[PDB]
Amino acid sequence: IVGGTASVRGEWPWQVTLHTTSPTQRHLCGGSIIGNQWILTAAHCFYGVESPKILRVYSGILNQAEIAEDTSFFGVQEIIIHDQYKMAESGYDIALLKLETTVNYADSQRPISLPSKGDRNVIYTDCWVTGWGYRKLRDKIQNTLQKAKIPLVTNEECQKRYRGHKITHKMICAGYREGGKDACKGDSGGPLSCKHNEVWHLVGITSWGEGCAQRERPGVYTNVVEYVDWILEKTQAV
Amino acid sequence: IVGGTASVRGEWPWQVTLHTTSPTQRHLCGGSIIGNQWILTAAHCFYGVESPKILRVYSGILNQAEIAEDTSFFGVQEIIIHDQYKMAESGYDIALLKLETTVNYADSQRPISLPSKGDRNVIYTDCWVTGWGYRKLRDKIQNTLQKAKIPLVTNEECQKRYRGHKITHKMICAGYREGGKDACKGDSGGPLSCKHNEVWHLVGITSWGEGCAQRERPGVYTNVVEYVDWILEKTQAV
Numbered sequence: 397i398v399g400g401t402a403s404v405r406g407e408w409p410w411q412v413t414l415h416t417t418s419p420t421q422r423h424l425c426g427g428s429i430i431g432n433q434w435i436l437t438a439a440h441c442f443y444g445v446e447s448p449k450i451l452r453v454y455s456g457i458l459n460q461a462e463i464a465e466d467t468s469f470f471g472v473q474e475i476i477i478h479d480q481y482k483m484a485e486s487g488y489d490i491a492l493l494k495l496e497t498t499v500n501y502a503d504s505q506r507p508i509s510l511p512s513k514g515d516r517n518v519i520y521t522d523c524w525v526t527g528w529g530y531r532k533l534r535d536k537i538q539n540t541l542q543k544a545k546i547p548l549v550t551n552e553e554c555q556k557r558y559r560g561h562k563i564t565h566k567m568i569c570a571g572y573r574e575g576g577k578d579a580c581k582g583d584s585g586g587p588l589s590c591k592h593n594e595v596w597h598l599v600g601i602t603s604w605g606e607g608c609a610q611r612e613r614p615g616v617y618t619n620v621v622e623y624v625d626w627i628l629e630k631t632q633a634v
Numbered sequence: 635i636v637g638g639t640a641s642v643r644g645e646w647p648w649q650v651t652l653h654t655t656s657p658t659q660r661h662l663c664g665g666s667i668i669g670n671q672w673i674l675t676a677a678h679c680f681y682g683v684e685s686p687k688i689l690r691v692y693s694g695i696l697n698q699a700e701i702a703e704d705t706s707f708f709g710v711q712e713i714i715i716h717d718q719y720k721m722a723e724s725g726y727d728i729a730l731l732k733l734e735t736t737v738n739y740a741d742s743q744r745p746i747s748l749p750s751k752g753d754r755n756v757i758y759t760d761c762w763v764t765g766w767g768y769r770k771l772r773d774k775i776q777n778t779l780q781k782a783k784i785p786l787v788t789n790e791e792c793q794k795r796y797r798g799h800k801i802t803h804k805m806i807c808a809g810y811r812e813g814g815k816d817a818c819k820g821d822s823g824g825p826l827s828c829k830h831n832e833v834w835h836l837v838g839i840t841s842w843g844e845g846c847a848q849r850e851r852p853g854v855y856t857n858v859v860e861y862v863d864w865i866l867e868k869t870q871a872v
């Protein structure tokens with residue numbers, strides 16, 4: 397996160413850190429708790445990941461320093477990548493992790509509500525991007541979970557800023573015209589969370605951008621509401 | 635290493651990477667193989683290290699990417715810190731690791747000779763600093779073992795550049811007047827290796843500097859030849 401600040405412990409209790417154990421353990425991506433056995437994240441996070449066995453999901457984390465060999469985590473039973481996904485910049489940058497065990501909800505770990513198709517008309521004015529990602533393009537993973545409040549921009553405006561891309565209705569963009577606050581490397585898969593009528597909604601999934609927090613380059617996010625049917629389909633038993 | 639280049643595999647076969655496993659595994663410091671059971675490194679590397687159980691020594695490494703949960707390593711049986719050590723900037727920045735098992739020497743892993751008291755008169759003109767450390771003050775650990783050729787400077791000259799310090803005869807300095815090449819964070823404990831009469835000698839141990847590779851700020855190293863009696867004393871059996 398560029399231009400963000402340190403979060404209060406547990407103020408983003410749906411936020412997880414997804415680690416890979418290969419070759420040695422490190423943060424890979426963000427993700428969001430959306431069900432007792434389900435994390436929603438970005439498909440592009442799994443580039444070169446050949447098995448869910450190397451993945452660990454940590455909930456209730458503020459600082460990466462909390463994670464040691466003796467820290468409890470959730471194993472991943474299955475990675476579900478959208479079948480239309482090719483790469484982040486083409487859209488469909490969405491994936492589910494089915495956990496091996498179920499999350500016991502508590503103040504530090506609980507699910508975020510999905511947006512409603514009826515909220516497509518809502519103007520979200522209180523949106524935040526969160527993660528342990530870079531503070532600038534060439535940087536490193538941060539210890540303390542960072543937060544930044546970022547305004548949504550229209551898809552029409554976003555298309556103006558990405559003339560070599562097709563910014564689709566399955567994407568949503570957020571950023572300041574002058575830049576300064578944005579997701580960056582390592583924030584991928586985390587939430588764009590918007591509070592509306594006292595409820596937090598998972599509006600976006602951090603996906604891509606040209607650089608981080610540059611002027612006239614909004615961050616691009618997966619438009620979660622366009623995938624509520626897919627999420628329902630994929631999270632049913634057998 | 636600032637201003638360095640990628641090493642050829644095994645061209646520094648005495649160079650080890652010392653990892654800590656706490657809280658999760660990461661490179662901590664460099665070190666040098668000097669005996670079948672002995673690594674020479676910097677005392678300051680062990681700040682807050684309460685037990686040798688959390689340490690792993692990896693030999694024969696070029697890229698950190700080689701190190702996975704299944705990669706062989708040497709355990710540490712004992713950390714021996716010089717009894718006069720207080721901090722890097724005051725000198726005595728020297729420590730031995732006694733390994734749990736012995737190193738089987740090969741082209742990729744073998745010991746470096748210690749300097750002779752009779753070489754105190756030698757002008758070393760072919761000295762190199764090596765490590766996986768930062769490329770600049772605020773950076774991160776590098777994948778490929780880096781090397782930089784750096785000229786020794788006189789202690790008189792070094793003292794000129796560090797007016798708030800006492801640069802002692804138990805220290806040795808190296809750097810360009812214009813800067814640009816130097817050790818940096820994460821290179822600590824590694825060798826300053828000088829080739830003289832076709833033999834590599836362990837002249838220094840990377841210790842400290844004000845910033846990395848700054849103009850008129852030579853890197854400061856432990857002057858290994860001043861500790862050959864100590865090394866002998868500490869590496870004897872019971």
Ligand SMILES: Cc1cc(N)nc2ccc(N)cc12
Binds near residue numbers: 578
């Ligand atoms: C995830 C992400 C978002 C963004 N807005 N910019 C980025 C730039 C580089 C990168 N590797 C990832 C990025």
Ligand SMILES: Cc1cc(N)nc2ccc(N)cc12
Binds near residue numbers: 842
């Ligand atoms: C080990 C080391 C050497 C040097 N020449 N400069 C440094 C600067 C900062 C730091 N943390 C370590 C350094």
